[PDB]
Amino acid sequence: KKMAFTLADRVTEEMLADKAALVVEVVEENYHDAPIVGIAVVNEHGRFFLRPETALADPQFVAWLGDETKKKSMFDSKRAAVALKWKGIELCGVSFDLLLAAYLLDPAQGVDDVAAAAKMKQYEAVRPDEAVYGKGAKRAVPDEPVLAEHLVRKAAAIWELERPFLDELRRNEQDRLLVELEQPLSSILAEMEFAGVKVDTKRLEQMGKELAEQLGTVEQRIYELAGQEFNINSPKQLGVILFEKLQLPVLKKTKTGYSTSADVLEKLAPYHEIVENILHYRQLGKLQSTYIEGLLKVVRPATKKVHTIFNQALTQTGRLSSTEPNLQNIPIRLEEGRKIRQAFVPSESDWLIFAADYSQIELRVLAHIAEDDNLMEAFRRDLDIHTKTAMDIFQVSEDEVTPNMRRQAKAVNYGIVYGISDYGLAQNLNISRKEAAEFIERYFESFPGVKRYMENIVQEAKQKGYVTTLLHRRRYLPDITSRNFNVRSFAERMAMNTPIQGSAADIIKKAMIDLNARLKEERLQAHLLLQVHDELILEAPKEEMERLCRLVPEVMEQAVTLRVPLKVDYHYGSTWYDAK
DNA sequence: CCTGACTCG
DNA sequence: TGCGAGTCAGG
């Protein structure tokens, strides 16, 4: 605990070195158009601190940040780049991101600051962000001397830990995953974040108005059937109405009381018609509060755009998450909700929304990884397994399978491949638990390869302590040999799923890098807007639609090569809704 | 702040 | 007693 640094007045030559650690401190958790409160640099020549109004105005510093031959090591470089694009400054030459490096080494650590990453290497010369800035309503940037030291210490740490982290990544054969997949992707996400998505507020406000009219309607109806007023959005009061006043049977409890989950409500339908009305009310209430009122609170009024943050170092399987707003969970399943998408539009004049989508991506990953004959064959002829399961459950034929019921048989295929027990399956389809068992038992005799993959990956996880995905992403399962049935089972199901979801996650990540490449090389104006786990979303001038119909799917299928082919569905239209 | 509800993959 | 997420209302 003793460090020398220079609290600089101006940018000097010795700070513009070819290799350095860089800290562009942004305290606000949502970094979009957020204050940059301090800058630090560590290189061969020394340790420096700079005030932002100094460094960001000095054209030489800006030129050094923008030069990709001047290599930077950073912690969460997406935060920096974005907070810099809002200051009209471009960041280039990031060769090491400690955050991503740490997330690949172990997603469970849930690293959020340099101190926690340093924790993994015994490096103790840096304080965590909360012990410096404060918590919640106390969150305060301290006095400069304190601020400076801390930032310099963060650089110093990034500076000392680069090699160790890279050294460990090389042993696990995860170095190329960092440098060639994750890190390049970080910059792409920073663009999509900054470009934003344009929203039709006029339309959005009109719908919430209509939604309110329907909410009051359904609501009155609910009080009439119940013969009283209560708070529908209060599960405790609703529970009293349904199970105490109305006497409806209790199908399930939780640790705090009676259950009123959608699943329980659908099963209570024969007994009383208020349950269906509650379901419908809850549906509309969510649309209003989250997808109208939530969404309008985060639009930037001047440009009518929303800017989400794609949290890259958070999920345990390798997926991304989307926050403030979440644009990866916009309604589509029920026609009423699906309408919200009409308000998502192109940002320019004659531009359109292109939406490409992988077909059964996790079922193909399972096929490739488990090497199952009957499964690999079905895909080679181009059978639709969801449609092959739609019939099998809905007694129907291929000729009449509505999109609605290809989604309900979709969750059965996936459910089965991810350790759903017969209790789960029967409780999802309202069928006999004996019949549920039969389905599964048949499935594993029909696909013996998939069954043995399940047995094997659990065995391997017990022996190794972890599982891995195609591009060597890793998840550790320390609870895998727990004596407790519940604890053991949960980790076992993670040993089944992770390699699959994680692999689909790797693939679509790679597909984005190649797409971005194939875009800038062909000099097109088209650019990525969103990723929703297994689908990409772009906007482009009307003219470019021809190339994209050929380009986008070609890139997504050619990303990786598997023991089965990869298929992509695509559509375009003037609204994200019409892109169906 | 947590629990349970809804939303997506 | 299928997996991975986020946000919101009530208590």
Ligand SMILES: Nc1ccn([C@H]2CC[C@@H](COP(=O)(O)OP(=O)(O)OP(=O)(O)O)O2)c(=O)n1
């Ligand atoms: N009920 C569901 C739906 C989705 N998923 C996970 C596993 C698959 C991954 C992608 O699913 P979708 O994009 O919904 O469908 P797909 O099978 O990948 O492709 P398609 O749209 O052609 O059915 O998300 C899941 O576990 N359970």
Ligand SMILES: OC[C@H]1O[C@@](CO)(O[C@H]2O[C@H](CO)[C@@H](O)[C@H](O)[C@H]2O)[C@@H](O)[C@@H]1O
């Ligand atoms: O930018 C995402 C990146 O930031 C970190 C901390 O450096 O997470 C913080 O910001 C997130 C996005 O706003 C919040 O969800 C989270 O609460 C906060 O810790 C990284 O963990 C994350 O990858």
Ligand SMILES: OC[C@H]1O[C@@](CO)(O[C@H]2O[C@H](CO)[C@@H](O)[C@H](O)[C@H]2O)[C@@H](O)[C@@H]1O
């Ligand atoms: O360095 C990580 C990198 O290794 C890759 C690419 O070479 O996988 C290769 O090495 C693996 C074992 O050494 C094999 O599974 C594979 O056959 C081989 O291509 C990437 O998957 C990984 O990111």
Ligand SMILES: [Mn+2]
């Ligand atoms: Mn898909």
